[PDB]
């Protein structure tokens, strides 16, 4: 395959045959994605390894898979010939699994997944009500895909789209199909990706760059790192296709150093692709050159800004600058640069493989495709979910996540982190979209979701988000640097039951200044939580001015 | 006379574009960024020390004080914060007498408040040397801190 | 391009970068705190808000297009601008009476104009830095984080010793690790101070020492620098004035100065000595290229950056030190008074001269150095109309000087003086001067006999690096740390932009024009000084020559766990690297800390922490009395401590 | 010494002398005074900025004939104030 596409197709067909052969036999996949490893997934993998080796009956295969969307349901394991799904797999009962299931195959009722809606246990996740209520378009082969294997990705039809784009298509038609598909920027803005690719390609310059923004843009979201650890090669293929489309010969992936697994997995994927020839001086003998490199993020929320990201990649402080000239013309080292989210690049190859009409079958007429989310807070089933761009908050909260834990009620929902919006029940029955809710003082955001319950204080929520923003400000412009700290001080005064009406008016008027006069998006959206809670939970602020806290948690007045 | 630092600098070829990665490597070697070490790096790469200091103090992963023997990493994400992270931080403070970003006298404990760890199902979540303790409360935090203190005190 | 501002027709310009500059060119001012000096950029203050098509935006980053309707004043913009100004003033150290920018501060003027009388926001506390260890004083509590000083020190001076650190509310412009500026590679050129729009960067005021000296019984002697007389007139809102030095002499004598001399005499003496030194170097073809030592900032920069060129630096000391040594060692004997009785006051335009006067090689020669601003403050205290003051000449025998000596005050002065001396001693067939760049000039000089050389004049530090790296065809290089020479020194009146510096150079040129004697040798007092005092080479070397030593940081800066401020102790340092931490290092540290907790009542033991000692793969390492142990453990460090 | 929030900022003789005299530090301790601030009336009082020149007293008594402000106490505690520190809006 290091010469042309014929040998690549031969290799892919043989790997498909090998994958089917292995799948037909007994095989094991343990979800080693974040969350499950926090519960002891690595110990479960070690237990399987040691048990299958001491008995020495490995024709069983032990593999590591990515997030299966049920992070809360303990470590996740499934056996292929009978696609049983196991949850809360303790390292201590692994010998029981090996003895009772791997060899014989008897179902284990005690280790299956529950059903929050119907209150029963289903042997297979594919038959679970939550799984049916979702719309998986990017997440393919849940629980049966090897994250650390380019061979598995190829055996699953992966990398076919890049070959099709190179051998058959030309950058102009790739950009045209991307524009027609209607894919929108998943970073949160929703800007049409096709327009961005056109801007980068039309920019005058021989050397261009492609940059991937691995940040989640939210301190309560893990969607992007989950996608990276699931299918690094999907994002890698998307980046290569984008580089071919915009005529770039260099790509940069920006993954936080705080995520060792994502960084290592992407490095492994890049090395494997280079070894297989998908990257290098000449890819598939088509005259197109491309290489990729992972840039570790030392940790700065402001580095999600395009200009700040470019500054951070070059080794400087992540300081943003007046956006025009846009990075699409003068970005990295002054050269044109294409900057997109992880999920955008993940969508790219999916759009290329399928058509435009087939892609647009899902979603709406402005926002085709799917949106991967990360639901948190007190709920029966929390984790990573994917839904089309037509679902409502109620669907996700109850039908997909199973609802709240007994003895806990809904108060509000966070949809985009600090820069997002605070929506109460009044907007729960609104279909998620980049336009339907972008006008009602809301936004789908990067994809993080957190549910706020009746025992959560909204003034406290605003204080927490403003504290985050105050810590994360780069300190370049006066509005953000100073006003965010002043607003945090005022919110702290509210929390400690020593605020007044004058403070309320000061906060209201300072929020408008911060939003309007701030340089970049971090400061512009800094007072979004204040504005949201004031518009939806004003009576709580008034109560705090009266030392009440109807939710009754701010440890500022009690037992007098 | 620095050798490992010189190895890193040669590996990344004294290019400022790799300054952040070089600093990360140096931190993983020394556990922090000593003044002498980055003065040497400054001399080797022909970059004023003030520039490296500005870069180092801008990003969170870089610490100028040594890491504690038991580095505590408390999640301050949205879900963890609403699940009771402030109580976890208060328990840590009242047990070891420190606040996030600080270190103890004998470098035994150090604390950092960080974003989501990807385990919101365990909110509130705490990490100590790669050991994640979920569903934590003041009682549990105090219990685990006391247990680790006894274990280390044993020395043996 | 015609636009609409508040509803009236306005013609701005054909091509413009942004609306703010275009309107400023027209004469329409938009309040802003970004344009503060020549090293200013746009985008940080956010106070230039204008309204266009409904949405508010900054005018400094808005491209003006034909037929654009812009409203520069709306109630929303007033609210936002006042909010931003109140935010700036809430955390600003508002003590203008003791501030160095009092009366010339844009922030103060805005606070006055915006009618800010109460702080609606809390004056929240920051981890501010107060550095007074050097003649350049840092106080970050007055910093508005404009970033002008950083750009000046990096892009203009080429040192880069001050940079932005931290982020958010803790953002601060500082040195690395908050190191005192005196201990950094700072050359003390004072250009950051000259460009700083607030009191965050200021010059160390030493007027109190001068007053207490004048009040005492000592003989106070003053000497004025050539560039001081070319700029002092700015502080009083008056135009150029030749004979400024003589009325300054009158004022100084009025306030109690026994003798006032001219540093131009010292400049002529230094030029004579340097000319002969350079001629010897040429005829021997050694220690070339030669570097002038008249600029202390350049000397310190070379010591920090070019230890190999320290032998190529001119041995002759600067005019200030040369004339001061002449005074203290010769004039005192001629007057029959002990050297302790003389108080030498230097009036300079430079902040690095304060450092030079305190150098270990110049100890006790110059007592205090006062900048031009400090002399202006002295004049303003008296309230005399310095314009009406009758001039009188400098005191003898160090009062007269040649045009070449007074030329020292601007770039190309010492090189021209040396050329004049050489021409007089041995004629110059022709001088051919080139201009490779803005602040670099190269001269091709041929002597009568036929021996020729190339001399270069470089003003503005930071241009030296490229010239020294790429040019090796010169035999003598004049380096001035400040653009335009000493007329743009750190201690000159504020503002200190390039237009004012060029005007100062013109004033100094006009002052030079009225000088009769043209070369140092024509200075008869100078030849007399050689004839009766500096006859032999031994005294000449001990009087007019100095030595230079390399500068290298000596930072230990190891972790302090249980430090001892002073006294005989054991200074036990425990390695804290990853390799050593892998087995026992931190636990051993805990053992030692508890040991000194129960034992070591006094400061006998100093439990200390240090980074890797390049002894890995050899068990945890613990330092004792600056000795290597290896395989360290509590019992071993104990026995070694015994 | 807080000129940014002062109405005499830019037109203050004391500010101009502080600038001209080169006062950059105060070796004299900032002693604590029982300063009086008043904001009850449109005319605002702040004795922390008072140099005790007595011009206001002469203006109020000789020129205006009211004499509601006058020198009180003595020594370091000398202050120009109203009778019994009464708020201005409550006086004549
Ligand atoms: C503070 C801040 C953080 C951001 N974080 C992210 C992020 O984590 N991921 C992302 O895709 N965009 C993020 N953005 C938005 C990007 O800077 C910008 O929209 C970029 O063009 C993303 O391209 P995309 O629309 O194709 O995703 C952030 C913006 C700001 C102001
Ligand atoms: S808004 Fe905040 S993050 Fe953005 S440039 Fe200004 S200070 Fe920096
Ligand atoms: S910089 Fe000095 S003069 Fe200007 S406002 Fe601040 S304290 Fe007053
Ligand atoms: S005095 Fe000169 S070298 Fe020192 S910090 Fe200021 S600009 Fe930099
Ligand atoms: S020290 Fe002065 S020049 Fe430097 S950033 Fe602060 S205000 Fe600006
Ligand atoms: S050029 Fe003149 S004013 Fe500037 S540092 Fe050198 S001697 Fe001082
Ligand atoms: S005595 Fe009266 S006029 Fe004089 S400063 Fe005090 S208040 Fe003002
Ligand atoms: S990481 Fe295992 S289900 Fe999400
Ligand atoms: S918010 Fe703490 S682990 Fe997700
Ligand atoms: S002039 Fe300062 S932001 Fe525009
Ligand atoms: S880590 Fe201790 S000698 Fe290197
Ligand atoms: Zn509350």
CA gap C527, B100 in Å, rounded: 72
What sign for the dihedral angle of Cα C234, C240, C241, C244? positive
Minimal CA separation from B148 to chain A, in Å: 19
Phi first, then psi, for residue B108 (nearest 5°) are -75, -35
User: Of C453, B44, A401, B129, whose CA–CA distance to B26 is shortest?
Assistant: B44
Chain C CB contacts of D45 below 8 Å = none
Probe target for ligand 2 pocket from A480, A482, A486, with the most ligand atoms within 8 Å of CB: A480
Beta bridge partner(s), residue C306: none
Cβ neighbourhood burial of C47 (10 Å; 0-12, 13-18, 19+): buried
Question: Which class for A178: exposed (0-12), middle (13-18), buried (19 or more C-beta within 10 A)?
Answer: buried
CA distances from D41 to C336, C348, C374, D45, D69 (A): 71, 53, 44, 9, 14
Say if residue A497 carries a ligand binding annotation.
Answer: no
Alpha-carbon gap: A443 to the closest alpha carbon of chain C (Å): 20
C37 classed as catalytic: no
**Which-ligand-closest: CA of A470?**
2
Residue of C98, C104, C105, C138 to mutate, interface with D, max D Cβ within 10 Å: C98
Angle at C157 between CA C152 and CA C161, to 5 degrees: 75
Whether residues A271 and A378 fall in one domain:
no
Experimental method: cryo-EM
Q: Are strands C607-610 and C572-575 parallel, antiparallel or unpaired?
A: parallel
Q: Which of B37, B50, B65 minimises the CB distance to C161?
A: B50
**What's the domain range around A463?**
458-546
Chain C environment of A478 (Cβ under 8 Å): 33, 44-47, 84, 87-88
Q: Of A34, A37, A293, A20, which Cα lies nearest the Cα of A152? A: A20
Does A touch D (3+ CB pairs < 8 Å)? no
DSSP 8-class letter at A305: S
Establish, for the pair of chains A and B, how many residue pairs have beta carbons separated by less than 8 Å.
117
Q: Is C274 part of the annotated catalytic residue set?
A: yes
Determine if residue A480 is labeled as part of a ligand binding site: yes
Which position has the token pair 């800066």?
C557
Which tokens sit at A456?
A: 């959560």
C102 alpha carbon – ligand 3 mean position (Å)? 6
Nearest C-alpha in B relative to C162: B50
C38 is catalytic: no
Nearest to A513 among C61, C83, C145 (CB): C83
Q: Is A301 annotated as a binding residue?
A: yes
Cα separation of C74 and C80, whole Å?
10
Is residue B35 within 8 Å of residue C555, measured between CB atoms?
yes
Instruction: Residue B3: list chain C partners with CB under 8 A.
Output: 614
Dihedrals phi, psi of D26, to nearest 5 degrees:
-130, 105
Resolution to 1 decimal place, in Å: 2.8
List of chain C residues whose C-beta atoms are within 8 Å of the C-beta of residue B50:
160-163, 165, 174-176
The reply to whether ligand 3 has any atom less than 6 angstroms from the CB of C202 is: no
Chain C CA closest to residue D21: C381
Say which of C37, C264, C314, C420 is annotated catalytic. C314
The closest-lying atom of ligand 3 relative to the alpha carbon of residue C198 is: 1
Q: Is the distance from the beta carbon of residue C194 to the nearest atom of ligand 6 less than 6 Å?
A: no
Distance in angstroms (rounded) separating the CA atoms of residues A411 and A552: 14
**Most distant CA pair in chain A: distance in Å?**
81
| Shortest-distance ligand to the CA of residue C412 | 6
Tell me which of C28, C49, C58, C110 to substitute to probe ligand 10's pocket, judged by most ligand atoms within 8 Å of the beta carbon: C58
Chains near A, with 3+ CB pairs < 8 A?
B, C
**Which residue's entry shows tokens 């979702």?**
A134
Q: Among A375, A404, A253, A30, which Cα is nearest to B116's?
A: A375
Whether the CB-CB separation of C312 and C295 falls below 8 Å is answered with no
Contacts of C103 in chain D (CB under 8 A): 15-16, 19
Q: For residue A489, which residues of chain C lie inside 8 Å, CB to CB? A: 121-122, 124
Atom nearest to C481 CA in ligand 4: 2
Looking at the CA of residue D57, tell me the nearest atom of ligand 7: 2
Q: Do C64 and C1 form a contact (C-beta atoms < 8 A)?
A: yes
Nearest to A363 by CA among A483, A444, A278: A444
Read off the tokens for A36: 């499950």
Is C155 one of the catalytic residues?
Answer: no
Using CA atoms, how far residue C32 sits from B155, C47, C49, C99, C111, in Å, is 63, 5, 9, 22, 12
Ramachandran category for residue A315: left, alpha or beta (phi over 0 → left; psi -120 to 50 → alpha): left
End-to-end CA gap in chain B: 36
Closest CA to A447 of A466, A420, A468, A424: A420
Count of CB atoms situated within 10 Å of the CB of C358: 15
CA A23 to CA C624: how far, in whole Å? Answer: 63
Instruction: Select the residue from A307, A317, A480, A517 to test the C interface by mutation, using most C Cβ atoms within 10 A.
Output: A517
Q: Give the C-alpha separation, A323 to A312, whole Å.
A: 16
Domain match, A487 and A527 both: yes
Q: Which two tokens stand for residue C115?
A: 């009618």
Q: How far away is chain A from the Cα of C164, in angstroms, using its nearest Cα?
A: 9
**Which positions in chain D touch C102 (Cβ < 8 Å)?**
3, 15, 18-19
**Is residue C417 among the annotated active site residues?**
no
Tokens of A242: 């984008």
A400 and A434 both lie in a single domain: yes
Nearest to A139 by CA among A457, A372, A405, A375: A372
CATH superfamily for C572-641 is: Glutaredoxin (3.40.30.10)
CB contact under 8 A, A450 and B20: no
Residue A499: phi, psi to the nearest 5?
A: -105, 170
Q: In what order do the strands lie in the sheet with A27-31?
A: A61-65, A27-31, A77-79, A84-86
Q: Which of C235, C246, C273, C274 is catalytic?
A: C274
Q: Closest residue of A to C60, CA-based? A: A322
Q: Neighbouring chains of C at 3+ CB pairs within 8 Å? A: A, B, D
Q: After which residues is chain A broken (C to N over 2.5 A)?
A: 58
Residue that the structure tokens 């005989």 belong to: C568
Strand-pairing partners, residue C259, are C221
Residue C180, SS3 per DSSP: coil
Q: If 0-12 CB within 10 Å is exposed, 13-18 middle and 19+ buried, where does residue A359 land?
A: buried
**Alpha-carbon distances of B69 from C575, C582, C588, C610, rounded to whole Å:** 13, 10, 11, 15
Where are any strands of DSSP class E within A443-553? 448-453
CA distances to B67, B124, B150 from B94, in Å: 20, 18, 17
- Considering only the beta carbons, identify the residue of B34, B105, B155 that sits closest to C611: B34
Q: What's chain C's Rg over C-alpha atoms? A: 29
Distance, CA A4 to ligand 1 centroid (Å)? 37
Q: Which atom of ligand 5 is nearest to the CA of C148?
A: 3
**From the CA of A61, how far away is ligand 2's center (Å)?**
51
Annotated ligand binding at A304? The verdict is: yes
Of B3, B105, B152, the CB nearest to C614: B3
In a shared domain, residues A381 and A349: no
| Same domain membership, residue A503 and residue A432 | no
The shortest CB-CB distance from C165 to any of B38, B53, B106 is to: B53
Pairing state of beta strands C290-291 and C476-480?
Answer: parallel
Q: Is C215 a catalytic residue?
A: no
Q: Could you tell me if D25 and C385 are in contact, meaning their C-beta atoms sit under 8 angstroms apart?
A: no
**Which sign, positive or negative, has the C-alpha torsion C35, C38, C39, C42?**
positive
Give the DSSP H or E segment for C594: helix C585-598
């Amino acid at each position: 395959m290091f010469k042309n596409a014929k040998e690549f197709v031969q290799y892919a067909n043989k790997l498909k045959t090998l994958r089917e052969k292995k799948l037909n036999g007994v095989s094991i996949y343990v979800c080693v994605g974040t969350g499950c490893t926090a519960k002891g997934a690595l110990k479960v993998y070690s237990a399987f390894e040691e048990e299958l080796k001491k008995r020495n009956l490995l024709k069983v295969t032990l593999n590591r898979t990515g997030c299966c969307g049920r992070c809360s349901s303990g470590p996740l394991v499934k056996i292929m010939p009978y696609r049983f799904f196991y949850s809360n797999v303790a390292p201590e009962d692994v010998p029981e699994i090996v003895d009772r299931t791997v060899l014989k195959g008897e179902p284990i009722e005690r280790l299956f997944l529950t059903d929050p809606l119907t209150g029963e246990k289903v042997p297979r996740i594919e038959d679970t009500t939550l799984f049916k209520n979702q719309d998986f378009y990017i997440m393919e082969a849940i629980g049966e895909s090897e994250c650390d294997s380019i061979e598995d990705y190829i055996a699953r039809s992966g990398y076919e789209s890049l070959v099709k784009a190179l051998t058959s298509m030309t950058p102009e038609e790739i950009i045209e199909t991307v524009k027609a598909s209607g894919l929108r920027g998943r970073g949160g803005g929703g800007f049409p990706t096709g327009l961005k690719w056109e801007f980068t390609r039309k920019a005058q310059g021989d050397i261009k760059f492609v940059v991937c923004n691995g940040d989640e843009g939210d301190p309560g979201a893990f969607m992007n790192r989950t996608l990276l650890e699931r299918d690094p090669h999907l994002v890698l293929e998307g980046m290569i296709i984008a580089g071919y489309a915009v005529g770039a010969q260099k790509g940069y992936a920006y993954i936080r150093a705080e995520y060792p697994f994502a960084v290592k997995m992407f490095k492994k994927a890049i090395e494997d692709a280079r070894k297989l020839g998908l990257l290098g001086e000449n890819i598939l003998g088509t005259g197109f050159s491309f290489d990729l490199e992972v840039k570790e993020g030392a940790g700065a929320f402001v580095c999600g800004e395009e200009t700040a990201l470019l500054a951070s990649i070059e080794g400087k402080r992540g300081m943003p600058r007046p956006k025009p000239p846009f990075p699409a013309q003068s970005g990295l080292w002054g050269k044109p640069t294409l900057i997109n989210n992880v999920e955008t690049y993940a969508n790219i190859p999916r759009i290329l493989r399928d058509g435009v009409e087939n892609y647009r079958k899902r979603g709406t007429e402005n926002s085709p495709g799917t949106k991967m989310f990360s639901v948190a807070g007190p709920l029966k089933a929390t984790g990573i979910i994917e839904v089309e761009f037509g679902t409502t908050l109620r669907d996700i909260i109850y039908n997909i996540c199973g609802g709240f834990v007994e003895g806990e009620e809904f108060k509000a929902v966070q949809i985009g982190g600090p820069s997002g919006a605070c929506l109460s029940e009044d907007f729960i029955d609104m279909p998620l979209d980049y336009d339907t809710l972008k006008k009602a003082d809301a936004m789908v955001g990067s994809g993080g979701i957190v549910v706020i319950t009746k025992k959560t204080c909204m003034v406290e929520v605003a204080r927490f988000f403003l504290d985050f923003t105050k810590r994360e400000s780069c300190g370049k412009c006066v509005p953000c640097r100073e006003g965010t700290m002043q607003a945090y001080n005022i919110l702290e005064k509210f929390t400690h039951g020593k605020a007044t009406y004058e403070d309320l008016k000061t906060l209201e008027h300072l929020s408008k200044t911060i939003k309007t006069a701030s340089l970049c998006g971090l400061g512009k959206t800094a007072p979004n939580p204040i504005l949201s809670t004031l518009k939806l939970f004003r009576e709580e602020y008034i109560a705090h001015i009266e030392g009440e806290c109807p939710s009754g948690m701010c440890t500022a007045f009690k037992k007098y | 006379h620095f050798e490992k630092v010189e190895e890193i600098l040669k590996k990344y070829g004294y290019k400022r574009e790799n300054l952040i990665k070089i600093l990360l490597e140096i931190q993983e070697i020394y556990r922090y960024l000593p003044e002498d070490v980055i003065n040497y790096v400054s001399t080797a790469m022909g970059i004023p020390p003030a520039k490296i200091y500005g870069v180092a103090t801008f990003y969170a992963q870089f610490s100028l004080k040594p890491k504690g023997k038991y580095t505590i990493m408390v999640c301050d994400g949205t879900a963890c914060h609403m699940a009771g992270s402030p109580e976890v931080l208060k328990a840590i403070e009242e047990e070891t007498g420190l606040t996030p970003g600080n270190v103890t006298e004998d470098l035994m404990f150090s604390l950092d408040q960080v974003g989501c760890l990807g385990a919101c199902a365990l909110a509130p979540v705490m990490v100590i040397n790669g050991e994640v303790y979920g569903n934590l409360t003041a009682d549990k935090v105090k219990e685990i801190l006391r247990k680790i203190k006894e274990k280390e005190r044993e020395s043996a | 391009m015609k636009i609409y501002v508040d509803g009236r027709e306005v013609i701005i310009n054909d091509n413009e970068r942004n609306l703010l500059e275009a309107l400023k060119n027209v004469g329409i001012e938009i309040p802003n705190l970004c344009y503060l000096s020549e090293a200013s950029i746009y985008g940080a203050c956010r106070m230039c808000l204008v309204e266009i098509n409904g949405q508010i935006t900054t005018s400094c980053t808005l491209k003006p297009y034909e037929g654009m309707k812009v409203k520069t004043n709306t109630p929303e913009i007033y609210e936002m601008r006042r909010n931003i100004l109140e935010l700036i003033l809430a955390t600003h150290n508002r003590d203008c009476t003791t501030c160095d920018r009092n009366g010339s501060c844009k922030l103060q003027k805005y606070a006055e104009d915006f009618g800010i009388r109460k702080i609606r926001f809390e004056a929240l506390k920051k981890e501010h830095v107060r550095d007074e260890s050097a003649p350049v004083v840092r106080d970050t509590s007055k910093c508005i984080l404009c970033g002008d000083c950083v750009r000046v020190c990096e892009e203009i001076q080429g040192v880069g010793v001050i940079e932005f650190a931290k982020r958010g509310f803790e953002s601060v412009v500082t040195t690395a690790f908050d190191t005192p500026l005196i201990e950094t590679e700072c050359v003390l050129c004072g250009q950051c101070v000259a460009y700083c729009p607030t009191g965050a960067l200021s010059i160390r005021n030493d007027i109190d020492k001068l007053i207490e000296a004048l009040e005492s019984d000592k003989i106070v002697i003053g000497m004025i620098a050539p560039a001081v007389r070319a700029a002092i007139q700015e502080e009083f809102g008056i135009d150029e004035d030749v004979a400024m030095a003589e009325k300054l002499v009158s004022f100084l004598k009025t306030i109690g100065f026994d003798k006032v001399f001219d540093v131009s005499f010292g400049a002529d003496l230094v030029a004579y000595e340097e000319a002969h030194e350079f001629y010897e170097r040429l005829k021997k073809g050694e220690r070339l290229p030669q570097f002038t030592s008249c600029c202390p900032a350049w000397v310190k920069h070379a010591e920090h950056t070019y230890p190999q060129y320290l032998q190529n630096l001119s041995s002759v000391k600067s005019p200030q030190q040369a004339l001061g040594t002449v005074i203290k060692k010769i004039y005192a004997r001629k007057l029959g008074v002990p050297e302790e009785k003389i108080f030498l006051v230097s009036f300079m335009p430079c902040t690095a001269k304060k450092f030079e006067a305190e150098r270990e090689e110049h100890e006790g020669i110059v007592d205090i150095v006062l900048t031009t601003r400090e002399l202006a403050q002295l004049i303003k205290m008296s309230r005399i109309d310095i314009n009406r003051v009758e001039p009188q000449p400098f005191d003898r025998p160090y009062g007269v000087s040649s045009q070449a000596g007074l030329g020292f005050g601007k770039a190309g002065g010492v090189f021209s003086c040396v050329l004049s001396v050489l021409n007089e001693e041995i004629g110059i067939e022709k001088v051919d001067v080139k201009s490779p760049e803005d602040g670099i000039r190269v001269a091709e000089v041929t002597l009568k006999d036929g021996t020729s050389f190339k001399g270069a004049v470089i003003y503005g530090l930071g241009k030296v690096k490229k010239f020294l790296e790429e040019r090796k065809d010169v035999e003598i290089i004049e380096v001035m740390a400040c653009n335009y020479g000493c007329v743009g020194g750190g201690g000159q009146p504020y503002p200190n932009d390039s237009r004012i510096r060029e005007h100062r150079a013109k004033v100094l040129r006009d002052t030079m024009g009225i000088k009769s004697l043209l070369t140092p040798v024509e200075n008869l007092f100078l030849m007399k000084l050689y004839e009766e005092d500096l006859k032999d080479e031994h005294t000449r070397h001990e009087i007019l020559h100095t030595t230079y030593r390399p500068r290298r940081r000596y930072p230990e800066k190891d972790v302090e766990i249980l430090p001892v401020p002073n006294g005989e102790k054991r200074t036990v340092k425990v390695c804290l690297g990853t390799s050593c931490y892998t087995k026992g290092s931190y636990e051993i540290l805990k053992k030692l800390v508890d040991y000194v907790k129960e034992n070591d009542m006094e400061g006998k033991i100093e439990v200390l922490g240090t980074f890797c000692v390049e002894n890995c793969g050899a068990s945890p390492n613990v330092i004792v009395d600056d000795k290597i142990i290896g395989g360290a453990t509590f019992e071993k460090v104990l026995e070694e401590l015994s």
